[PDB]
Design an enzyme around this catalytic site. Structure first.
Site, PDB file in Angstrom:
ATOM      1  N   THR A 266       0.800  -1.212   0.000  1.00 13.53           N
ATOM      2  CA  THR A 266       0.000   0.000   0.000  1.00 13.53           C
ATOM      3  C   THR A 266       0.839   1.270   0.000  1.00 13.53           C
ATOM      4  OG1 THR A 266      -0.179  -0.126   2.412  1.00 13.53           O
ATOM      5  CG2 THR A 266      -1.927  -1.156   1.117  1.00 13.53           C
TER       6      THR A 266
ATOM      7  N   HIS B 122       5.738   0.322   7.967  1.00 12.38           N
ATOM      8  CA  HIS B 122       5.994   1.007   9.225  1.00 12.38           C
ATOM      9  C   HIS B 122       5.729   0.042  10.375  1.00 12.38           C
ATOM     10  CE1 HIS B 122       1.684   1.225   9.554  1.00 12.38           C
ATOM     11  NE2 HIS B 122       1.573   2.087   8.560  1.00 12.38           N
TER      12      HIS B 122
ATOM     13  N   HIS C 133       3.042  -2.734  10.890  1.00 11.24           N
ATOM     14  CA  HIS C 133       3.126  -3.987  10.154  1.00 11.24           C
ATOM     15  C   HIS C 133       4.115  -4.970  10.763  1.00 11.24           C
ATOM     16  CE1 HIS C 133       2.364  -0.768   6.938  1.00 11.24           C
ATOM     17  NE2 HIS C 133       1.192  -1.311   7.207  1.00 11.24           N
TER      18      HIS C 133
ATOM     19  N   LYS D  28     -12.521  -0.913   7.120  1.00  9.50           N
ATOM     20  CA  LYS D  28     -12.247   0.410   6.579  1.00  9.50           C
ATOM     21  C   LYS D  28     -13.563   1.061   6.181  1.00  9.50           C
ATOM     22  CE  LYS D  28      -7.716   1.058   6.106  1.00  9.50           C
ATOM     23  NZ  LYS D  28      -7.097  -0.120   6.792  1.00  9.50           N
TER      24      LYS D  28
ATOM     25  N   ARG E 247     -10.669   2.493  -0.632  1.00 14.24           N
ATOM     26  CA  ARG E 247      -9.305   2.764  -1.061  1.00 14.24           C
ATOM     27  C   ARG E 247      -9.286   3.103  -2.546  1.00 14.24           C
ATOM     28  NH1 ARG E 247      -5.305   0.058   2.193  1.00 14.24           N
ATOM     29  NH2 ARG E 247      -6.215  -1.004   4.007  1.00 14.24           N
TER      30      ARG E 247
ATOM     31  N   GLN F  69      -7.865 -13.378  -1.308  1.00 10.99           N
ATOM     32  CA  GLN F  69      -7.149 -13.840  -0.123  1.00 10.99           C
ATOM     33  C   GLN F  69      -7.611 -15.226   0.304  1.00 10.99           C
ATOM     34  OE1 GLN F  69      -6.894 -10.939   3.027  1.00 10.99           O
ATOM     35  NE2 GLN F  69      -6.163 -12.423   4.544  1.00 10.99           N
TER      36      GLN F  69
ATOM     37  N   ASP G  96      -7.486  -7.468  11.924  1.00 15.94           N
ATOM     38  CA  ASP G  96      -8.584  -7.185  11.013  1.00 15.94           C
ATOM     39  C   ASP G  96      -8.714  -8.218   9.899  1.00 15.94           C
ATOM     40  OD1 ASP G  96      -6.242  -6.499   9.728  1.00 15.94           O
ATOM     41  OD2 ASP G  96      -6.976  -4.582   8.952  1.00 15.94           O
TER      42      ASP G  96
ATOM     43  N   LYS H 238      -3.682   6.001  18.937  1.00 15.28           N
ATOM     44  CA  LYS H 238      -3.274   4.995  17.962  1.00 15.28           C
ATOM     45  C   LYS H 238      -1.811   4.616  18.180  1.00 15.28           C
ATOM     46  CE  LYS H 238      -3.705   3.875  13.021  1.00 15.28           C
ATOM     47  NZ  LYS H 238      -3.914   4.385  11.634  1.00 15.28           N
TER      48      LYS H 238
ATOM     49  N   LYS I 263       0.855   6.577  15.767  1.00 13.77           N
ATOM     50  CA  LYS I 263       0.559   7.970  15.450  1.00 13.77           C
ATOM     51  C   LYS I 263       1.446   8.866  16.304  1.00 13.77           C
ATOM     52  N   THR I 264       2.442   9.490  15.681  1.00 13.08           N
ATOM     53  CA  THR I 264       3.299  10.459  16.348  1.00 13.08           C
ATOM     54  C   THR I 264       3.110  11.831  15.715  1.00 13.08           C
ATOM     55  OG1 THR I 264       5.314  10.412  15.000  1.00 13.08           O
ATOM     56  CG2 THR I 264       4.939   8.555  16.496  1.00 13.08           C
TER      57      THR I 264
HETATM   58  N1  LIG Z   1      -5.239  -8.761   3.753  1.00  8.51           N
HETATM   59  C1  LIG Z   1      -3.883  -8.496   4.217  1.00  8.51           C
HETATM   60  C2  LIG Z   1      -2.869  -8.828   3.119  1.00  8.51           C
HETATM   61  C3  LIG Z   1      -2.962 -10.255   2.625  1.00  8.51           C
HETATM   62  C4  LIG Z   1      -2.841 -10.554   1.274  1.00  8.51           C
HETATM   63  C5  LIG Z   1      -2.934 -11.855   0.821  1.00  8.51           C
HETATM   64  C6  LIG Z   1      -3.150 -12.878   1.721  1.00  8.51           C
HETATM   65  O1  LIG Z   1      -3.248 -14.182   1.285  1.00  8.51           O
HETATM   66  C7  LIG Z   1      -3.272 -12.605   3.066  1.00  8.51           C
HETATM   67  C8  LIG Z   1      -3.187 -11.301   3.509  1.00  8.51           C
HETATM   68  C9  LIG Z   1      -3.752  -7.041   4.654  1.00  8.51           C
HETATM   69  O2  LIG Z   1      -4.657  -6.236   4.420  1.00  8.51           O
HETATM   70  O3  LIG Z   1      -2.753  -6.636   5.256  1.00  8.51           O
END
Ligand SMILES: N[C@@H](Cc1ccc(O)cc1)C(=O)O
Length: 427
Positions: free
Chosen positions: A40, A45, A48, A82, A86, A175, A196, A231, A234-235
């Site tokens: 993304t 950061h 993750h 969300k 996006r 996914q 999530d 959060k 968040k700085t």
């Molecule tokens: N959905 C995850 C990314 C992801 C992509 C592929 C997958 O098989 C699993 C996870 C995210 O938003 O961070």
């Protein structure tokens, strides 16, 4: 200690389909697990870190970790939890990000031995999958009513929500298929992810049963929360990126130093590889000693060494010990490049500027007449030492910023008072 017992000791298990069967499976044999990372941005950061670190915790117990980079899923967008749609990134954009975050995940995992990590990309199978085969071979196993009632997207579907496009509404299919595909390719029997990801993980569990007739498991990691409700990353300066060219190792090291006393012991368990016993001794020493707690520094040393390396930790320590210090001769050119990135408020100045001009230009004073009081009060420091007169004037140029004050001919740390100061950069 068990693998599951270690994760639940750290509070790292949020949801899991069958904890008893997953625990008994990990003690009976070695498995392959996987976690997915979507491109993304140009870099990750600290938000993750948990999933890729959890992969390493499994690899330490002899299990094979699979780090999936979303070369294809990054072209759709995960709508889980969300409230707004996006935007769609271009293929050129995502392809570059795939190479960037892949270079950031690989350092966390070992590629030696029988349990060597595997780097996968779901563009390998979706990049050549026809749309009809997608809607048929995957889509026939999905109930729209079940998809609409998933907590991850239900708030978008309700009358109050912003709505969801067909694009992102289809994300759980991609996914979901990833779990079945990695189960077939590399024997993946476990998918971990952020808090999530429960909806998309169970979707890949069901889909793997329907497509491969195999029992797989899923585990989600907790939402990294702070005691004061704010959060996690968040700085005031923005996000705490993993790329050193976006946030300097000094500011990275500084972020972990400022962790609250309530949060620091949980973060040691979440993010470091110190044992529960080692962390327990760190906590008990701080809780019994009447001195300042040492856990934040230990957290900062562990995280900076892990992400940036031993030399970068030494740089962050050297800057932290030299920035407010009397003697700043320890600072190197690379140290100042970190400071100009996000260490200090940087301001560009040229030759001829005097002290009162830089004092107000950097915001260290409202007016020069106010700053002129700070100058004659001996409250102004240049590179740790107070400013000295060095001119026969011409009116205010008695305190001039000549080349002697230029660290490496480019930088000068301007300080006013005990706290709050700025960095001068010479053009
Ligand atoms: N959905 C995850 C990314 C992801 C992509 C592929 C997958 O098989 C699993 C996870 C995210 O938003 O961070």
């Amino acid at each position: 200690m068990s693998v599951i017992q270690d994760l639940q000791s750290r509070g790292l298990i949020a949801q899991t389909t069958d904890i008893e069967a997953l625990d008994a499976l990990l003690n009976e044999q070695k498995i392959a697990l996987y976690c997915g990372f979507d491109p993304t941005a140009d870099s990750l950061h600290i938000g993750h870190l948990l999933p890729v670190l959890a992969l390493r915790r499994f690899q330490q117990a002899g299990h094979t970790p699979i780090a999936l980079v979303g070369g294809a899923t990054g072209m759709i967008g995960d709508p889980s939890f969300k409230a707004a749609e996006r935007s769609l990134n271009s293929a050129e954009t995502v392809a570059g990000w795939v190479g960037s975050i892949r270079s950031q995940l690989t350092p966390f995992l070992s590629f030696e031995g029988g349990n060597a990590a595997i780097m996968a990309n779901n563009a390998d199978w979706f990049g050549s999958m026809n749309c009809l085969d997608f809607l048929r071979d995957i889509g026939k196993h999905f109930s729209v009513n079940a998809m609409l009632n998933k907590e991850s997207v239900k708030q978008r579907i309700d009358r109050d929500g912003a709505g969801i496009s067909f694009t992102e509404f289809a994300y759980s299919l991609l996914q979901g298929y990833d779990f079945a595909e990695l189960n077939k390719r590399h024997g993946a029997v476990l998918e971990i992810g952020g808090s999530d990801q429960w909806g998309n993980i169970t979707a890949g569990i069901d889909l793997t049963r329907r497509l491969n007739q195999k029992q797989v498991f899923g585990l989600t990691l907790p939402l990294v929360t702070k005691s004061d409700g704010t959060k996690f990353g968040k700085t005031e300066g923005g996000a705490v990126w993993l790329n050193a060219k976006k946030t300097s190792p000094y500011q990275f090291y500084q972020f972990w130093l400022k962790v609250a006393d309530a949060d620091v012991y949980k973060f040691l368990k979440y993010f470091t590889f110190l044992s529960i016993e080692e962390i327990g001794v760190v906590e008990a020493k701080d809780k019994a000693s009447g001195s300042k707690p040492e856990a934040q520094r230990i957290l900062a040393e562990e995280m900076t060494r892990l992400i940036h390396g031993e030399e970068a930790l030494a740089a962050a320590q050297r800057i932290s010990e030299s920035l407010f210090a009397e003697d700043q001769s320890r600072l190197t050119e690379s140290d100042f490049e970190q400071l100009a990135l996000d260490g200090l408020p940087a301001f560009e100045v040229s030759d001829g500027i005097n002290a009162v001009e830089a004092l107000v230009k950097t915001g260290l004073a409202a007016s020069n007449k106010e700053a002129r009081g700070f100058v004659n009060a001996k409250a102004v420091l240049l590179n740790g030492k107070p400013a000295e007169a060095n001119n026969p004037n011409h009116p205010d140029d008695a305190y001039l910023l000549i080349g002697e004050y230029k660290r490496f001919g480019k930088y000068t740390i301007l300080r006013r008072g005990k706290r709050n100061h700025a960095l001068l950069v010479w053009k």
